[PDB]
Design an enzyme around this catalytic site. Structure first.
Site, PDB file in Angstrom:
ATOM      1  N   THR A 271       6.025  36.989  31.640  1.00 45.95           N
ATOM      2  CA  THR A 271       5.436  35.753  32.183  1.00 45.95           C
ATOM      3  C   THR A 271       5.256  34.686  31.078  1.00 45.95           C
TER       4      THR A 271
ATOM      5  N   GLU B 284      15.533  45.191  30.728  1.00 50.72           N
ATOM      6  CA  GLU B 284      16.824  44.586  31.007  1.00 50.72           C
ATOM      7  C   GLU B 284      16.748  43.543  32.110  1.00 50.72           C
TER       8      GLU B 284
ATOM      9  N   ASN C 255      14.186  41.737  32.999  1.00 51.66           N
ATOM     10  CA  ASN C 255      13.469  40.544  32.547  1.00 51.66           C
ATOM     11  C   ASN C 255      14.331  39.726  31.610  1.00 51.66           C
TER      12      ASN C 255
ATOM     13  N   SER D 215      13.805  46.978  21.889  1.00 52.42           N
ATOM     14  CA  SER D 215      12.390  47.152  21.645  1.00 52.42           C
ATOM     15  C   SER D 215      12.006  46.741  20.234  1.00 52.42           C
TER      16      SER D 215
ATOM     17  N   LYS E 131      -9.479  39.209  26.339  1.00 47.66           N
ATOM     18  CA  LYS E 131      -9.808  40.640  26.435  1.00 47.66           C
ATOM     19  C   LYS E 131      -9.974  41.241  25.039  1.00 47.66           C
TER      20      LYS E 131
HETATM   21  N1  LIG Z   1      -2.768  36.302  32.267  1.00 49.27           N
HETATM   22  C1  LIG Z   1      -1.842  36.694  31.415  1.00 49.27           C
HETATM   23  O1  LIG Z   1      -0.753  37.106  31.828  1.00 49.27           O
HETATM   24  C2  LIG Z   1      -2.200  36.576  29.984  1.00 49.27           C
HETATM   25  C3  LIG Z   1      -3.250  35.745  29.537  1.00 49.27           C
HETATM   26  C4  LIG Z   1      -3.545  35.674  28.193  1.00 49.27           C
HETATM   27  C5  LIG Z   1      -2.828  36.452  27.295  1.00 49.27           C
HETATM   28  N2  LIG Z   1      -1.841  37.256  27.766  1.00 49.27           N
HETATM   29  C6  LIG Z   1      -1.146  38.131  26.817  1.00 49.27           C
HETATM   30  O2  LIG Z   1       0.228  37.795  26.721  1.00 49.27           O
HETATM   31  C7  LIG Z   1       0.983  39.000  26.480  1.00 49.27           C
HETATM   32  C8  LIG Z   1       2.106  39.100  27.503  1.00 49.27           C
HETATM   33  O3  LIG Z   1       1.592  38.923  28.834  1.00 49.27           O
HETATM   34  P1  LIG Z   1       2.539  38.638  30.084  1.00 49.27           P
HETATM   35  O4  LIG Z   1       1.644  38.243  31.220  1.00 49.27           O
HETATM   36  O5  LIG Z   1       3.658  37.781  29.673  1.00 49.27           O
HETATM   37  O6  LIG Z   1       3.086  40.136  30.333  1.00 49.27           O
HETATM   38  P2  LIG Z   1       4.559  40.579  30.769  1.00 49.27           P
HETATM   39  O7  LIG Z   1       4.553  42.066  30.928  1.00 49.27           O
HETATM   40  O8  LIG Z   1       5.018  39.760  31.982  1.00 49.27           O
HETATM   41  O9  LIG Z   1       5.486  40.150  29.567  1.00 49.27           O
HETATM   42  C9  LIG Z   1       5.629  40.932  28.382  1.00 49.27           C
HETATM   43  C10 LIG Z   1       7.101  41.018  28.087  1.00 49.27           C
HETATM   44  O10 LIG Z   1       7.193  41.741  26.833  1.00 49.27           O
HETATM   45  C11 LIG Z   1       8.197  42.714  26.990  1.00 49.27           C
HETATM   46  N3  LIG Z   1       7.924  43.820  26.074  1.00 49.27           N
HETATM   47  C12 LIG Z   1       6.822  44.597  26.163  1.00 49.27           C
HETATM   48  N4  LIG Z   1       6.871  45.506  25.136  1.00 49.27           N
HETATM   49  C13 LIG Z   1       7.994  45.266  24.396  1.00 49.27           C
HETATM   50  C14 LIG Z   1       8.708  45.854  23.267  1.00 49.27           C
HETATM   51  N5  LIG Z   1       8.192  46.906  22.641  1.00 49.27           N
HETATM   52  N6  LIG Z   1       9.808  45.244  22.835  1.00 49.27           N
HETATM   53  C15 LIG Z   1      10.375  44.206  23.450  1.00 49.27           C
HETATM   54  N7  LIG Z   1       9.862  43.668  24.558  1.00 49.27           N
HETATM   55  C16 LIG Z   1       8.679  44.156  25.018  1.00 49.27           C
HETATM   56  C17 LIG Z   1       8.192  43.106  28.452  1.00 49.27           C
HETATM   57  O11 LIG Z   1       9.385  43.717  28.946  1.00 49.27           O
HETATM   58  C18 LIG Z   1       7.896  41.786  29.129  1.00 49.27           C
HETATM   59  O12 LIG Z   1       9.072  41.071  29.529  1.00 49.27           O
HETATM   60  C19 LIG Z   1       0.044  40.221  26.520  1.00 49.27           C
HETATM   61  O13 LIG Z   1      -0.451  40.590  25.218  1.00 49.27           O
HETATM   62  C20 LIG Z   1      -1.112  39.596  27.264  1.00 49.27           C
HETATM   63  O14 LIG Z   1      -2.349  40.308  27.090  1.00 49.27           O
HETATM   64  C21 LIG Z   1      -1.506  37.340  29.058  1.00 49.27           C
HETATM   65  N1  LIG Z   2      21.763  49.293  41.164  1.00 49.39           N
HETATM   66  C1  LIG Z   2      22.934  49.806  41.497  1.00 49.39           C
HETATM   67  O1  LIG Z   2      23.664  49.185  42.269  1.00 49.39           O
HETATM   68  C2  LIG Z   2      23.401  51.112  40.995  1.00 49.39           C
HETATM   69  C3  LIG Z   2      24.394  51.785  41.683  1.00 49.39           C
HETATM   70  C4  LIG Z   2      24.816  53.003  41.248  1.00 49.39           C
HETATM   71  C5  LIG Z   2      24.284  53.548  40.100  1.00 49.39           C
HETATM   72  N2  LIG Z   2      23.308  52.867  39.452  1.00 49.39           N
HETATM   73  C6  LIG Z   2      22.766  53.448  38.218  1.00 49.39           C
HETATM   74  O2  LIG Z   2      21.371  53.753  38.374  1.00 49.39           O
HETATM   75  C7  LIG Z   2      20.748  53.540  37.089  1.00 49.39           C
HETATM   76  C8  LIG Z   2      19.518  52.653  37.263  1.00 49.39           C
HETATM   77  O3  LIG Z   2      19.924  51.488  37.981  1.00 49.39           O
HETATM   78  P1  LIG Z   2      18.858  50.519  38.645  1.00 49.39           P
HETATM   79  O4  LIG Z   2      19.636  49.587  39.568  1.00 49.39           O
HETATM   80  O5  LIG Z   2      17.687  51.287  39.175  1.00 49.39           O
HETATM   81  O6  LIG Z   2      18.363  49.662  37.350  1.00 49.39           O
HETATM   82  P2  LIG Z   2      16.876  49.158  37.015  1.00 49.39           P
HETATM   83  O7  LIG Z   2      16.908  48.451  35.710  1.00 49.39           O
HETATM   84  O8  LIG Z   2      16.304  48.438  38.216  1.00 49.39           O
HETATM   85  O9  LIG Z   2      16.049  50.505  36.838  1.00 49.39           O
HETATM   86  C9  LIG Z   2      16.045  51.274  35.648  1.00 49.39           C
HETATM   87  C10 LIG Z   2      14.591  51.593  35.317  1.00 49.39           C
HETATM   88  O10 LIG Z   2      14.639  52.431  34.150  1.00 49.39           O
HETATM   89  C11 LIG Z   2      13.639  51.958  33.238  1.00 49.39           C
HETATM   90  N3  LIG Z   2      14.078  52.291  31.879  1.00 49.39           N
HETATM   91  C12 LIG Z   2      15.203  51.836  31.289  1.00 49.39           C
HETATM   92  N4  LIG Z   2      15.295  52.424  30.058  1.00 49.39           N
HETATM   93  C13 LIG Z   2      14.222  53.226  29.877  1.00 49.39           C
HETATM   94  C14 LIG Z   2      13.654  54.066  28.829  1.00 49.39           C
HETATM   95  N5  LIG Z   2      14.270  54.171  27.655  1.00 49.39           N
HETATM   96  N6  LIG Z   2      12.568  54.787  29.103  1.00 49.39           N
HETATM   97  C15 LIG Z   2      11.889  54.672  30.249  1.00 49.39           C
HETATM   98  N7  LIG Z   2      12.276  53.871  31.258  1.00 49.39           N
HETATM   99  C16 LIG Z   2      13.427  53.151  31.092  1.00 49.39           C
HETATM  100  C17 LIG Z   2      13.573  50.477  33.520  1.00 49.39           C
HETATM  101  O11 LIG Z   2      12.420  49.804  33.049  1.00 49.39           O
HETATM  102  C18 LIG Z   2      13.751  50.340  35.023  1.00 49.39           C
HETATM  103  O12 LIG Z   2      12.504  50.359  35.721  1.00 49.39           O
HETATM  104  C19 LIG Z   2      21.784  52.949  36.109  1.00 49.39           C
HETATM  105  O13 LIG Z   2      22.343  53.966  35.247  1.00 49.39           O
HETATM  106  C20 LIG Z   2      22.842  52.446  37.052  1.00 49.39           C
HETATM  107  O14 LIG Z   2      24.155  52.264  36.456  1.00 49.39           O
HETATM  108  C21 LIG Z   2      22.849  51.703  39.880  1.00 49.39           C
HETATM  109  O1  LIG Z   3      -6.516  43.877  43.602  1.00 49.07           O
HETATM  110  C1  LIG Z   3      -7.220  43.231  42.799  1.00 49.07           C
HETATM  111  C2  LIG Z   3      -6.743  42.983  41.518  1.00 49.07           C
HETATM  112  C3  LIG Z   3      -7.540  42.312  40.613  1.00 49.07           C
HETATM  113  N1  LIG Z   3      -8.783  41.939  40.991  1.00 49.07           N
HETATM  114  C4  LIG Z   3      -9.652  41.196  40.066  1.00 49.07           C
HETATM  115  O2  LIG Z   3      -9.021  39.945  39.846  1.00 49.07           O
HETATM  116  C5  LIG Z   3      -9.237  39.544  38.452  1.00 49.07           C
HETATM  117  C6  LIG Z   3      -7.880  39.300  37.819  1.00 49.07           C
HETATM  118  O3  LIG Z   3      -7.229  40.574  37.766  1.00 49.07           O
HETATM  119  P1  LIG Z   3      -5.722  40.547  37.162  1.00 49.07           P
HETATM  120  O4  LIG Z   3      -5.146  41.912  37.431  1.00 49.07           O
HETATM  121  O5  LIG Z   3      -5.011  39.376  37.666  1.00 49.07           O
HETATM  122  O6  LIG Z   3      -5.904  40.321  35.624  1.00 49.07           O
HETATM  123  P2  LIG Z   3      -6.888  40.852  34.443  1.00 49.07           P
HETATM  124  O7  LIG Z   3      -8.112  39.963  34.447  1.00 49.07           O
HETATM  125  O8  LIG Z   3      -7.138  42.311  34.662  1.00 49.07           O
HETATM  126  O9  LIG Z   3      -6.032  40.622  33.226  1.00 49.07           O
HETATM  127  C7  LIG Z   3     -10.050  40.656  37.805  1.00 49.07           C
HETATM  128  O10 LIG Z   3     -11.426  40.284  37.894  1.00 49.07           O
HETATM  129  C8  LIG Z   3      -9.781  41.847  38.714  1.00 49.07           C
HETATM  130  O11 LIG Z   3     -10.893  42.758  38.743  1.00 49.07           O
HETATM  131  C9  LIG Z   3      -9.246  42.185  42.288  1.00 49.07           C
HETATM  132  O12 LIG Z   3     -10.390  41.795  42.633  1.00 49.07           O
HETATM  133  N2  LIG Z   3      -8.469  42.831  43.158  1.00 49.07           N
END
Ligand SMILES: NC(=O)c1ccc[n+]([C@@H]2O[C@H](COP(=O)([O-])OP(=O)(O)OC[C@H]3O[C@@H](n4cnc5c(N)ncnc54)[C@H](O)[C@@H]3O)[C@@H](O)[C@H]2O)c1
Ligand SMILES: NC(=O)c1ccc[n+]([C@@H]2O[C@H](COP(=O)([O-])OP(=O)(O)OC[C@H]3O[C@@H](n4cnc5c(N)ncnc54)[C@H](O)[C@@H]3O)[C@@H](O)[C@H]2O)c1
Ligand SMILES: O=c1ccn([C@@H]2O[C@H](COP(=O)(O)OP(=O)(O)O)[C@@H](O)[C@H]2O)c(=O)[nH]1
Ligand SMILES: O=c1ccn([C@@H]2O[C@H](COP(=O)(O)OP(=O)(O)O)[C@@H](O)[C@H]2O)c(=O)[nH]1
Ligand code: NA
Ligand code: NA
Ligand code: NA
Ligand code: NA
EC number: 4.2.1.135
Lengths: 340, 339
Positions: free
Chosen positions: B35, B59, B61, B82, B150
């Site tokens: 996000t 992948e 994202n 990663s 947080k």
């Molecule tokens: N409301 C919010 O969403 C909010 C508010 C304030 C701060 N933040 C902070 O911003 C950060 C990200 O939040 P977000 O809402 O974008 O979450 P998100 O899960 O949507 O985005 C995080 C992204 O980082 C990637 N990622 C996670 N671990 C990784 C790794 N080891 N290597 C490479 N890629 C990796 C994920 O695949 C994902 O696309 C968090 O630390 C969160 O606490 C979020």
């Molecule tokens: N989508 C299709 O049309 C299709 C058809 C036939 C076969 N497949 C095969 O199925 C497999 C998955 O496809 P999909 O469509 O579900 O893709 P996808 O990306 O939606 O799902 C894969 C999941 O595996 C997780 N993942 C990836 N690497 C990981 C790791 N190192 N550890 C833990 N979790 C991990 C991802 O986060 C994701 O949630 C692929 O090998 C693909 O080639 C897909």
């Molecule tokens: O199903 C839900 C999910 C979340 N929350 C509340 O909504 C706020 C925002 O939650 P969110 O999961 O969006 O983010 P967080 O504050 O945990 O990062 C927090 O007070 C949660 O307790 C809720 O009332 N119902």
């Protein structure tokens, strides 16, 4: 919808067979939040698994499948983990002692894997090796890996990595540790796929982008593919490479044109953008005329020979340090014809 | 929309300042498909970055942000990785030599991190250490980490991990490697958040599930929060912990009620489900009365002291192997009060 129009509607779905396979098992699904993994999770619940262990490295994906199954929260455990972390994975297997692993974790996007071939090797081949090895070491009874028609005579890094994974997993199968792989083609509406791309183009009044006027894929609904995967796992004795009957080929141009007709959006043009590196015009037909029949008309068994694991483990080491991954993959998979 | 009603509409957005900061830079965004990461990517393009390196381990994202930016494909590089993979990350940095890293890769779900505390430590603390170390070794000029309310007097594993990441990165800042951390509260409609959950419940004819009738959060639109992050980054000299003015607190019950009103589904009930482990009823207000002003009314500088890196590195080694993660984190972050 075009999903309904392109569903296979297999006549040989067998709920009681799958229930017999899964009832009261502890089952671990890798890639549990993915398109295929999520459906595997839902069907594990449907068909009576006692305890589902959901492993995924993507937090949103894990969050979402855990939320989707909240009515069953008492029998599911969300494990936020990459399968590359052998030590943590081993701890999970010891803690929960699954009897079955359904392995659906991988990278699948052909273009991204062309651009990131080392990550494709590490996540797909090393991840599968780590998970399969940990499973066998921890006495998991059965291991089923999801595979792709892209693994057949591969022309791209992605598909070639999946073929290496087939070779590795099948070569690990023995009388204590039963492995099966199941190959199928495209799942309708899957993450990051053509149907959601076309939907997002049509919503935003943008021309549809078609790679080539003649391109064809085979399609199935995710619930159909996954239940057939589970039926194959249920009948597997170990060492089988299964292939699904996908039905008729679909021209993507007819898919695009139907989406326009159904959306009532014939105002939009279809633009040709070109075949991408690694991309096939027609994927391979999965069922060979000499494959073995099963009791299910949709599931066949393809030929596969084991390879020596000493050799394959050495090649997998080489893949991790080599200068030219394409070249190294060709050493393992002689049928690899890299479309650069 | 609910999003419009709760937007901050900060009066001190400054496009030309951000452009001056980003124009013709090579910028790497970790978590580029997330996000916050995705919006950072979009703003990097908008404000003139020369080359954007998008790093994400998910992948879909990565695929999605790369597709979203397809009109700019010649200026962007999708890296499927990663940040825990030091060797490959080092190769990326040595190859592309970014001058700025915007670090938005983490795990953020409080419940999942309570259930998976070792993975929260590894992904958040070790990942941040690996990325920050690689950045400093590869002579990245500036490093900006996204942080959270947080992280302030944390009550959960997730937020405590983020606080450790602040301590680590800020302690790494020096004359040649300028670090800033920017804390803000909830982003409206972020991945896996309350607004999408409530939308899905209403769409499926389900009662809304509210944690606690009194619970409150602070909110901003993602474009607002990100632009302010970038303004803070632009003014940073290194070592700064910035905090954003989030405006007024929002009671989640009022959010829920407004979403029902806006959807004309007052027929649906709001069910109270209870405060979860680690969860705060009221997150901390970010701006302290002794924080320093900046030229932007929305951005303040909070006090922070560097810690000894030899000590903290040892503590981080222990966190990777210890069985008592909550207790171990409390030794690093004395203000942690685990709920
Ligand atoms: N409301 C919010 O969403 C909010 C508010 C304030 C701060 N933040 C902070 O911003 C950060 C990200 O939040 P977000 O809402 O974008 O979450 P998100 O899960 O949507 O985005 C995080 C992204 O980082 C990637 N990622 C996670 N671990 C990784 C790794 N080891 N290597 C490479 N890629 C990796 C994920 O695949 C994902 O696309 C968090 O630390 C969160 O606490 C979020
Ligand atoms: N989508 C299709 O049309 C299709 C058809 C036939 C076969 N497949 C095969 O199925 C497999 C998955 O496809 P999909 O469509 O579900 O893709 P996808 O990306 O939606 O799902 C894969 C999941 O595996 C997780 N993942 C990836 N690497 C990981 C790791 N190192 N550890 C833990 N979790 C991990 C991802 O986060 C994701 O949630 C692929 O090998 C693909 O080639 C897909
Ligand atoms: O199903 C839900 C999910 C979340 N929350 C509340 O909504 C706020 C925002 O939650 P969110 O999961 O969006 O983010 P967080 O504050 O945990 O990062 C927090 O007070 C949660 O307790 C809720 O009332 N119902
Ligand atoms: O924008 C797109 C994306 C895909 N396709 C085609 O639609 C089919 C399905 O592509 P998808 O990405 O859905 O999956 P893949 O077959 O690569 O696994 C393939 O023939 C693609 O060339 C297309 O014409 N336009
Ligand atoms: Na779904
Ligand atoms: Na549970
Ligand atoms: Na200005
Ligand atoms: Na978006």
């Amino acid at each position: 919808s075009i999903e309904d129009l392109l569903a296979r509607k297999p006549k040989d779905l067998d709920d009681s067979a799958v229930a017999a396979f899964l009832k009261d098992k502890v089952v671990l699904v890798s890639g549990a939040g993915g398109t295929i993994g999520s459906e595997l999770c839902k069907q594990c619940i449907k068909f009576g698994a006692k305890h589902l262990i959901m492993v995924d490295h993507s937090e949103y994906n894990l969050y979402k499948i855990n939320d989707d199954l909240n009515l069953y929260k008492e029998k599911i455990t969300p494990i936020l983990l990459s399968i590359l972390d052998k030590q943590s994975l081993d701890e999970v297997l010891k803690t929960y002692k699954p009897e079955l692993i359904l392995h659906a974790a991988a990278y699948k996007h052909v273009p991204l894997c062309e651009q990131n071939p080392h990550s494709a090797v590490i996540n797909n081949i090393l991840g599968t090796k780590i998970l399969c090895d940990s499973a066998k070491e921890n006495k998991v009874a059965k291991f089923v890996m999801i595979s792709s028609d892209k693994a057949v005579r591969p022309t791209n890094i992605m598909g070639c990595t999946k073929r290496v994974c087939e070779l590795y997993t099948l070569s690990m199968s023995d009388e204590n540790f039963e492995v099966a792989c199941v190959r199928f083609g495209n799942v309708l509406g899957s993450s990051g796929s053509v149907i959601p791309k076309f939907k997002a183009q049509i919503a935003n009044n943008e021309p549809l982008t078609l790679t080539h006027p003649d391109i064809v894929r085979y399609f199935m609904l995710v619930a159909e593919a996954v239940q057939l995967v589970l039926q194959a796992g249920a009948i597997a004795k170990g060492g089988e490479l299964f292939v699904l009957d996908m039905g008729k080929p679909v021209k993507i141009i007819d898919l695009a044109k139907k989406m326009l007709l159904l959306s009532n959006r014939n105002d939009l043009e279809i633009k040709i953008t070109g075949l991408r590196k690694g991309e096939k015009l027609y994927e391979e037909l999965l069922i060979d005329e000499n494959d073995a029949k099963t009791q299910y008309e949709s599931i066949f068994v393809a030929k596969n020979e084991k390879v020596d694991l000493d050799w394959l483990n050495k090649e997998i080491e080489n893949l991790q340090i080599c200068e030219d991954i394409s070249e190294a993959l060709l050493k393992i998979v002689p049928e690899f014809k890299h479309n650069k």
